[PDB]
Amino acid sequence: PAKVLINGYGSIGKRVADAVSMQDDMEVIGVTKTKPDFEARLAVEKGYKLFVAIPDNERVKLFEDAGIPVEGTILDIIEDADIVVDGAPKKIGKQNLENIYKPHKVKAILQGGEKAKDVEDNFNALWSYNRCYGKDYVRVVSCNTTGLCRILYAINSIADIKKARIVLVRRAADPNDDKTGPVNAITPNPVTVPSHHGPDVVSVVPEFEGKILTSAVIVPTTLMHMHTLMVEVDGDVSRDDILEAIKKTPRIITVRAEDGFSSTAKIIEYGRDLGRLRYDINELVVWEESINVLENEIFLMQAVHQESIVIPENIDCIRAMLQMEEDNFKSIEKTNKAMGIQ
């Protein structure tokens, strides 16, 4: 199997570690932490080899004193990896790329908080798997960009996109985060319109240049982001065609407000009750009743579980970069089956 190192066992990192372990063709050779906390302990209890992410002997001693077994530092494992999945905080992925991955000549994936310009290309399994094939340094794009890429793939499959206008209503803090607000405000993020979210999608889909217009705010919720879409298309599609295209596209599911899905709280409750690990819904979720077509324009609202949506993308990205699977859909299906998702 492919030997995968997870550098940064955090919200993304810990999920990719488990998602890699679920595959039959890759394995986790180590995960890293900087703090000797309950999450570091959980990594060890799960059976992962734990390394200190920063090459600092004093920090290693901190873990040993806290009674958490460590195998060494990032430098003790980096040479054994076929690829590194970087899960480090925003800006730190690029630091690791320049300070560690590149000097050790090892392939690495950065997450969506890093820049398009920091890497060789930008990954979504439906659009740029082939472009990322055999590449060395790739960015798996953000939760929002990932969600937009999927719904835009669905729409593109049945009509040509002329202009996609999207408003993103983003969560303030992940559930674990007890420090970040706002408690009670709506925050323009950014204040400028159109925002950088549109160009981010274009980094994956160059043909959408000048056709994506976004605006975003942050609100006091932790569970999921919501996106609202109004998309002018060239073509005569019906609501049924759009619904069918969404159902056909891997990693998009629909819910019905008629069935009791009144909000993002209900989508997460479904994730919990379904028995999903960490409640993760890696699929983009579209409200069925929101889907409409009026005069060559498609409307819908959708929700993104930001902690988990990019996890299967990381798995497919590994297969692309390591040349493990030639066929993007074959990788998607393999990943999906291993993770128990659609």
Next chain:
Amino acid sequence: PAKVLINGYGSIGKRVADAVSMQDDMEVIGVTKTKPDFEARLAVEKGYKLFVAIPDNERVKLFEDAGIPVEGTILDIIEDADIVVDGAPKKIGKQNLENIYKPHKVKAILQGGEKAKDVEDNFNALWSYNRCYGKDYVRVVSCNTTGLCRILYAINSIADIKKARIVLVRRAADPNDDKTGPVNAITPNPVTVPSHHGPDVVSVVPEFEGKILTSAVIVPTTLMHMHTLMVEVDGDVSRDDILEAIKKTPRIITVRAEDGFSSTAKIIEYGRDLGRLRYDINELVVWEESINVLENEIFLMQAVHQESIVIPENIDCIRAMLQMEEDNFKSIEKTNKAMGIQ
């Protein structure tokens, strides 16, 4: 002075009562409540005559047992009114119109939760003042509709609107409301797109029929709603033209994120520190840095203080309905001067 009865001394009602009092040409002859609470007490302390909103002797005694002075019931005061501002809950305004205002042959204003078909016309001071002139039963439209009316007037002043695409991010509960959620969700409201918000603007501006497309959600905030606008126009407008039109239009002001206005929390902090009564910001608030024009399409974000935005509209509507001033802009200026707003 015009003799104004406030039937329903609630969030809107208590504010319209004070705004009427600030005018030199109208007076509040009474306000009504159903429950003997601290708000009933406050009305009395402020010098208003309090009547019981429901003509029920058992209810009058409830007020007497609470030691809150009441002057009688709605039936003891209704025949003295030149006009009734209804401030009752959604659906109750229409009940009051059919059961009280019409049988007593008295003009009445209903609030935005009531229906366009419930009344003779739909009021905003910029657009429909003349059309509502001398009418007997008028709806002052909702917080959201009033805000959209104002920004669309500013834009219409300099270019013809082709399509206005709006996403409304609505507050869950007014500050006083400690019973309504969601605590932690984003809730499509409605799930259908385009939503009823667009046609509500059309009830005011018939020429906007089929040109306004809206979607709305509710989030865990109390302070203000936010709106995002992307508006296709006919005509060559600049950013500076829009900014100027916004500045020129009464009851729209701008704030700069560069000045520390990071969110709706900062806007409210400003209303508080300014010394506004109840911190009310009756003006629509547009973020300056949000205003953009790209290929004949105007972008901006704005915030609406839902509790107070319709208050000065009620005052102007009284003037139109009682034929007190033929010039909409003269009523607007007068209303604004008396309230201390722009």
